[PDB]
């Protein structure tokens, strides 16, 4: 689907494109995101030589991300300090936060520039 | 035959140190297997006294692993299980590893079992064959207390796997962090009317981010995105 | 057997019941007089053949009786005074079935056993862990409330009596000889005996009161007295009892702590109120209006 | 030819039953131009679960004795990884784990998304 | 250690000074915590900060040879001991608060920056703000105190004080409680250094410098989003007026001469140009207009600030007069 985004980029987005995965299992999600994740790393490299040089973004979106990902930061930790003293569990409950964790991120996961 | 070990590193994204070593060379004949000497043939060969015996019997048979949990009892039949139901022998070298001598079908079957909180634990089963399993677990539900919940493992437990989960996201936390950080870092990279000018001048916020860094980051986080996909299909399968 | 030993060890005939195992049993195990030897000792014959069915078998009725009798012979050994002695037995009792409630008292009571000796931070572990796996945590409370008296963090004893006070408030069975059956009562001496909310409201104010809080262990002593005399609606809360200090003492308590607070018009008028509703507590009702 | 096909990676708490899976063919008379076509399974025998990415890794291996210290050599050929998209099937474009019901036995929703953009 | 075992050190776990590996070392606090009964994150945290009490008494406020290469090795320990969750992080903050003395303000920003707790986590898991407090106040004194001894320590002492502010500031505008608290009592001791007394440039002159240098929102404002700086600046200023209003004597006028804008000190001169450089004329006006409207006055400061202000903004002389016909 392409999509144009204005608040990425200063000037005017780029016209993006975007790739979606939907389906009952996480699992499969998991498995497809690794999929087109493992192919926009090569290609990126592989177009590091070309040297397309991926215009310069504004900075209230980097602090508005910034902000969404050091409350997550938190919460993981304080949950990796309750698993280590034992204090909550590690059976479940934890795995299904975790899992929202996840799923908060691969939605927009790498927007690439 | 010959037998070749080959090595390949999962790391390095190159594909670059993939030795190899050839380890020997095995020769087998029917004038051998008719002395014996190499084969595995029950009981007379009960007590193992060549590991390697051991280690034949935990190649070739058929692993399952089940986690057991009490909720609301405490666990120590297992060790009474193991010992008197299944009449077993702890090996010496290995004694996380008991042996079935109960004469009938379970024997040559093989235990392990890890405790952990004493309510939960963990066995591991190599049988000779799945139906052989399928009667140990029979034995022993029958004789675990009432609302014992087992659960057979596919890829580890969930206390290793919420662990290996919860490391990849704080490190792909972090990067997607250190984004930001080396961001800010670039980002910052009549005489008192002037001096006010000049230092306007100077705080001019700089609204604008180098392509090529935040590049750099989104591969670094990409690599760290891949680590938490495995993890993630590791504990959702689960 | 293991129904008349269930029988027995309900009722304490523990010299019937050891004199009837040692008949079981071969009488070579004579001098034996133990009983915790004589019921491991004691092998019930088979694996219960194609036989009439039966709600419990001599094994699932042996593994109870050693967990019921170890956790009593731990207990007494404590009260008694030989907290060496219990540790055995009280290991022996969580070294078998054990129901989780019956754990969750198995570690108070080391954690008694270990602060008698002289070991808080052993005695703390037990504590933690009690707490943890329990869904009843008053009985931890109240031994952490004991053994920081013993150190002389008072401000630590007074919270953990207030987390027990918020404890009271908060609150299945199988047709099968369980270990919930062979239990005792427990006696007033035991590590895990807990008053009701009266009793231990008042314990806490007290305590508070000793240490020199009077403002505080004042608004315990009214949030307590509030509710013997203000109660006529809800569940009726028990009496701080007859051991423990009579009514008027409770009020005269009330009026001290009051006055240590400031609150003299308010000592008064507790001090009128209970000549109305009526010795040496006149004497003193006079005293304490003398110095409001 | 040795062909040998990793399994799901990452050493786990509980060393699995099949960490790999190895097969070796002999090549004869190959020739310029020929080619030789080897088919193998990946798929699941085992539960009806199949754990990506799996790679499938072939190399060559020369003797030395088999012409007349341990003495040979192997050289790397490719390395191939199969993921999820190379194992969908569009089909109108043209089982529920036994241990874990006998267990069952024994004792007796939203879409998931993920997405990303990229420059056009 | 003395009642279980019979009669805690890094030497103890690895049994006399074995070896020095990672995994063995790790390895040892298992089996003594398997000995002790307690959970090993608890041990390696406790051993972690004895060991950091050590490193920071054996021979002030930072920390520069040989002691910079243990507390590394160990906080290289620390990470390997946190990846294989061996680390309790409360923990660890508590055992270091018991501390508390020994611990220096460079041990707290190594630990910050290496990641292995942060400054916000710390500063949030002490039981007596109090302490916190004061025991900052000392430490961001000292160190205002050096940053002059060579320009070398000087780049690692604002690093870890520009790291400080930037935390504070960010917090405390958008607990919290103590961040502001700091930030006040910051304040108020430059303005007793300045308006109440005389300093000879030889100490605490020195202090109000460097603090009004880290103030100055360059190295501050290119990271901070300059929503909440101005209200960071804007409740400065506020404070800057209301504290001490002594000399509301009306009859404060031959004291103009003296608070004339060469006798008025280079540094209050310094800090009020740069609360006009991060915020702007007009808003500031009618910011002054309601402050002064609604509470009372420190006429010194108020009276150098105008003195100040005029020749600063460009042709604003308009629009005091126009507040002054207003009042």
């Known amino acids: 689907r392409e999509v144009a985004m204005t608040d990425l980029c200063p000037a005017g987005p780029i016209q993006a494109v975007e790739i979606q995965v939907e389906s009952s299992s996480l699992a499969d999600i998991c498995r497809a995101h690794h999929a087109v994740v493992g192919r926009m790393q090569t290609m990126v490299t592989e177009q590091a030589t070309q040297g397309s040089s991926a215009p310069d973004l504004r900075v209230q979106y980097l602090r508005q991300i910034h902000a969404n990902h050091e409350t997550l930061l938190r919460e993981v930790q304080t949950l990796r300090d309750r698993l280590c003293t034992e204090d909550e569990a590690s059976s479940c409950a934890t795995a299904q936060r975790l899992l929202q964790v996840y799923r908060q991120l691969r939605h927009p996961s790498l927007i690439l520039l | 035959c010959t037998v070749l070990l080959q090595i390949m590193e999962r790391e390095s994204g190159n594909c670059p140190k993939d030795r190899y070593v050839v380890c020997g060379r095995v020769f087998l004949s029917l004038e051998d297997l008719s002395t014996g000497k190499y084969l595995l043939t029950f009981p007379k060969k009960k007590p193992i006294e060549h590991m390697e015996d051991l280690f034949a019997l935990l190649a070739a048979f058929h692993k399952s692993c089940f986690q057991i949990t009490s909720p609301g009892y405490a666990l120590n039949s297992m060790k009474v299980w193991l010992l008197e139901h299944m009449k077993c022998e702890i090996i010496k070298e290995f004694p996380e590893v008991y042996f079935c001598e109960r004469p009938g079908s379970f024997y040559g079957t093989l235990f392990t079992w890890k405790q952990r909180t004493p309510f939960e634990g963990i066995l591991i089963i190599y049988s000779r064959n799945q139906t052989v399993m399928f009667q140990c677990l029979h034995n022993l539900i029958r004789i675990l207390p009432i609302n014992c919940f087992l659960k057979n493992l596919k890829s580890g437990s969930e206390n290793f796997l919420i662990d290996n989960m919860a490391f990849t996201l704080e490190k792909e936390l972090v990067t997607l962090s250190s984004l930001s950080s080396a961001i800010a870092k670039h980002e910052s990279n009549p005489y008192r009317k002037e001096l006010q000018r000049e230092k306007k001048k100077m705080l001019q916020t700089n609204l604008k981010v180098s392509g090529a860094l935040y590049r750099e980051i989104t591969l670094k986080v990409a690599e760290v995105q891949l680590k938490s996909d495995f993890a993630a299909q590791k504990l959702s399968n689960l | ?292 | 030819l040795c062909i040998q096909v990793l399994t799901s990676s990452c050493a786990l708490d509980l060393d699995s039953a099949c960490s790999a899976i190895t097969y070796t063919i002999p090549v004869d008379q190959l020739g310029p131009g020929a080619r030789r076509e080897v088919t193998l399974p990946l798929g699941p025998g085992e539960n009806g679960g199949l754990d990506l990415p799996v790679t499938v890794s072939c190399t060559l291996f020369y003797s030395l004795r088999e012409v007349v210290e341990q003495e040979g050599v192997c050289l790397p050929l490719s390395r191939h990884t199969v993921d999820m998209l190379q194992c969908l099937r569009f089909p109108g474009l043209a089982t529920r784990d036994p241990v874990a019901t006998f267990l069952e036995t024994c004792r007796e929703l939203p879409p998931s998304v993920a997405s990303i953009k990229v420059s056009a | 250690l003395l009642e279980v075992e019979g009669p805690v050190i890094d030497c103890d776990s690895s049994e006399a000074y074995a070896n020095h590996s990672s995994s063995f070392i790790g390895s040892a606090l298992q089996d003594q915590a398997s000995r002790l009964g307690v959970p090993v994150g608890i041990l390696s945290a406790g051993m972690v900060a004895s060991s950091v009490g050590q490193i920071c008494t054996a021979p002030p406020v930072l920390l520069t040879v040989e002691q910079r290469k243990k507390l590394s090795s160990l906080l290289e320990f620390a990470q390997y001991l946190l990846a294989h969750s061996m680390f309790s992080r409360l923990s660890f903050c508590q055992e270091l608060w018991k501390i508390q003395s020994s611990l220096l303000l460079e041990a707290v920003w190594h630990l910050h920056v290496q990641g292995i707790v942060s400054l916000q986590e710390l500063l949030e898991s002490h039981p007596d703000m109090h302490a916190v407090g004061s025991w900052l106040f000392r430490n961001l004194c000292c160190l205002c105190e050096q940053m002059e001894a060579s320009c070398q320590h000087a780049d690692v002492a604002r690093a870890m004080l520009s790291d400080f502010v930037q935390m504070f500031v960010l917090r405390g505008f958008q607990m919290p409680q103590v961040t502001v608290d700091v930030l006040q009592r910051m304040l108020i001791f430059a303005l007793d250094a300045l308006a109440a007394g005389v300093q000879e440039e030889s100490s605490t002159h020195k202090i109000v410098r460097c603090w009004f240098g880290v103030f100055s929102g360059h190295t501050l404002g290119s990271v901070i989003s300059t929503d909440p700086l101005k209200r960071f600046f804007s409740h400065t200023l506020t404070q800057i007026l209301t504290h001490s209003p002594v000399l509301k004597a009306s009859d404060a006028v031959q004291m103009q001469r003296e608070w004339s804008f060469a006798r008025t000190h280079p540094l209050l001169t310094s800090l009020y140009r740069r609360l006009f450089v991060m915020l702007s004329a007009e808003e500031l006006v009618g910011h002054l207009q309601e402050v002064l409207e609604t509470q009372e006055v420190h006429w010194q400061r108020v009276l150098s600030f105008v003195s100040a202000l005029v020749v600063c903004f460009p042709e604003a002389q308009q629009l005091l007069e126009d507040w002054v016909a207003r009042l």
Not at chain 3, 152 to 181: C, H, K, M, R, Y
Not at chain 3, 271 to 289: F, G, I, K, N, Y
Request: charge should be negative; charged fraction near 15%; hydrophobic fraction near 45%.
């Open chain 3, 1 to 292: 057997v293991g129904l008349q030993a269930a029988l027995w060890l309900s009722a304490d005939r523990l010299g019937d019941l050891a004199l009837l195992l040692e008949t079981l049993n071969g009488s070579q195990s004579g001098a034996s007089k133990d009983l915790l030897l004589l019921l491991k000792t004691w092998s019930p014959p088979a694996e219960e053949l194609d036989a009439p069915l039966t709600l419990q078998d001599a094994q699932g009725l042996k593994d109870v009786l050693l967990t019921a009798f170890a956790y009593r012979q731990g207990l007494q050994e404590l009260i008694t005074g030989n907290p060496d002695k219990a540790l055995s037995s009280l290991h022996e009792a969580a070294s078998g079935l054990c129901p989780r409630p019956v754990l969750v008292q198995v570690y108070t009571a080391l954690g008694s056993c270990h602060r008698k000796m002289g070991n808080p931070q052993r005695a703390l572990l037990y504590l933690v862990a009690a707490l943890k796996e329990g869904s009843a945590w008053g009985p931890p409370l109240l031994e952490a409330s004991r053994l920081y008296q013993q150190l002389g963090d008072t401000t630590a004893e007074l919270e953990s009596l207030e987390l027990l006070v918020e404890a009271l408030n908060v609150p299945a069975p199988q047709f099968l000889i369980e270990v919930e059956l062979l239990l005792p009562p427990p006696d007033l001496a035991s590590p895990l005996h807990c008053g009701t909310q009266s009793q231990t409201k008042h314990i806490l104010a007290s305590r508070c009161l000793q240490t020199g809080r009077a403002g505080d262990a004042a608004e315990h002593y009214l949030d307590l007295l509030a509710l013997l005399l203000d109660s006529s609606e809800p569940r009726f809360s028990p009496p701080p009892s007859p051991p423990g200090p009579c009514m008027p003492e409770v009020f005269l308590e009330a009026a001290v702590a009051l006055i240590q607070a400031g609150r003299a018009q308010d000592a008064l008028t507790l001090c009128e109120e209970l000549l109305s509703r009526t010795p040496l507590w006149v004497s003193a009702t006079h005293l304490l209006q003398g110095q409001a």
